[PDB]
Design a protein around this ligand. Structure first.
Ligand code: HEM
Ligand SMILES: CC1(C)[C@@H]2CC[C@@]1(C)C(=O)C2
Ligand SMILES: [K+]
Length: 404
């Protein structure tokens, strides 16, 4: 717990810890949404993790992400030492500077590339699922949630699959630190890995994501090796720690809700609308910004240098944004969320993520329409910059499945 700063008033202190929230055993989304109870203000100060503001409502999250003159991306992580070490491109830059780097990034992970990767996504999801189908059981986090998104990413990056254990270890210490490494050691270990590769593909340009970035142009000028590395690192974390977690939340829920499985088996054309609704209910990212100057926002005096966590996860969870927000409803008419961010840094990998999610639900339910949590398992969730599921044991009767 850190010393409450002179400028923060006693009545806005709410000691929420993002890496280990109090109600965590009820579900990570449920743990986070304690900040939306009737007793809690729209903007609190927490003394954990060195101290930082936290906006709790969708209205303030969106306003702050839009206002980059006051809410800067220069130090976007908590704790303070992680945000100061954070130098990924484009995420650590504010517009106007940030803008030229998005279109290089858009070229390696945007729609055009989802279109080059279309066959391979479909094939690996069918082949992974078909290999599990006859067993009548799986450890989903390890058997599908990781290998499906991860092997597509390594394929696109032109990186070998036995580098996976090392890279996921490191990427995961930057979002859910276990204590062994600091964000900076983790980051420098990712750059160390990328350095020879980047230089080699600048001499012999290939077709893979690293070559494209490294030999890319930024509003007409050549990107440097240091910029290539800083953009490249960011793509790996996005590739190895986003969709991987998201798929486990969605499959846990489907395993617990036979009527929602039935809806999608009956009307598979509803899968894209259902993916959106699940992205709202099982939203999982929470990063933030730093104040560029002293500023008064929604009646609270903020101080230059203060950090503020603006939980992207909380906006679609807000009862002011969606009625009965904890309830999953695939026909929800206005699905409002900030799952993929808001403002000028809107997620560049969202078209890739949505395709991987929709391909997984359609291809799973086609082959293994009925499935449940294994008898007597209690699912445990984990919290951090990106939230996730520690293990998900699923069971099914092989007599009810079909090889497609
Ligand atoms: C469920 C999956 C995903 C979610 C929920 C998600 C969420 C986000 C969010 C919230 C941001 C903005 C953060 C900020 O403003 O500080 C972001 C940015 C970004 N994400 Fe995604 N992401 C996902 C998947 C991916 C994937 C699969 C990739 C690439 C392999 C990716 C690459 C990027 C990049 C490059 C940016 C930077 C945008 C910028 O700074 O201009 N993301 N993502
Ligand atoms: C907050 C994020 C999800 C977004 C993409 C990966 C992530 C950890 C960042 O560093 C940017
Ligand atoms: K920084």
């Amino acid at each position: 717990l850190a010393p409450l700063p002179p400028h923060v008033p006693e009545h806005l202190v709410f000691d929420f810890d993002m890496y280990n929230p109090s109600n965590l055993s009820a579900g990570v989304q449920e743990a986070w949404a304690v900040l939306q109870e009737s007793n809690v203000p729209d903007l609190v100060w927490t003394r954990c993790n060195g101290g930082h503001w936290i906006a709790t409502r969708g209205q303030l999250i969106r306003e702050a992400y839009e206002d980059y003159r006051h809410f800067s991306s220069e130090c976007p992580f908590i704790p303070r030492e992680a945000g100061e070490a954070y130098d990924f491109i484009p995420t650590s830059m504010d517009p106007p500077e940030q803008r030229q780097f998005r279109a290089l990034a858009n070229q390696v992970v945007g729609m055009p590339v989802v279109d080059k990767l279309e066959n391979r996504i479909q094939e690996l999801a069918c082949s992974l699922i078909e290999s599990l189908r006859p067993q009548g059981q799986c450890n989903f986090t390890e058997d599908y949630a990781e290998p499906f998104p991860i092997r597509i990413f390594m394929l696109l990056a032109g990186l070998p699959e036995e580098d996976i254990p090392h890279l996921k270890y490191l990427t995961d210490q930057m979002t859910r630190p276990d204590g062994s490494m600091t964000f900076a050691e983790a980051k420098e270990a990712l750059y160390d890995y990328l350095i020879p590769i980047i230089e080699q593909r600048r001499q012999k340009p290939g077709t893979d994501a690293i070559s494209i970035v490294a030999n890319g142009q930024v509003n007409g000028r050549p990107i440097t090796s240091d910029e290539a590395k800083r953009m490249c690192g960011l793509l790996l974390v996005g590739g190895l720690d986003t969709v991987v977690n998201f798929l486990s939340f969605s499959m846990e829920f489907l395993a617990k809700s036979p009527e929602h499985r039935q809806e999608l088996i009956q009307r598979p054309e509803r899968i894209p609308a259902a993916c959106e609704e699940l992205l709202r209910r099982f939203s999982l990212v929470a990063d933030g910004r730093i104040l560029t100057s002293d500023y008064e926002f929604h009646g609270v005096q903020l101080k230059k240098g203060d950090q503020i966590l603006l939980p992207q996860m909380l906006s679609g969870l807000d009862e002011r944004e969606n009625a009965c927000p904890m309830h999953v409803d695939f026909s929800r008419q206005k699905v409002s969320h900030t799952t993929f961010g808001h403002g000028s840094h809107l997620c560049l990998g969202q078209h890739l993520a949505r395709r991987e999610i929709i391909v997984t639900l359609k291809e799973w339910l086609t082959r293994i329409p009925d499935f449940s949590i294994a008898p007597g398992a209690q699912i445990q969730h984990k919290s951090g910059i990106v939230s996730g599921v520690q293990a998900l044991p699923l069971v099914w009767d092989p007599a009810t499945t079909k090889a497609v």
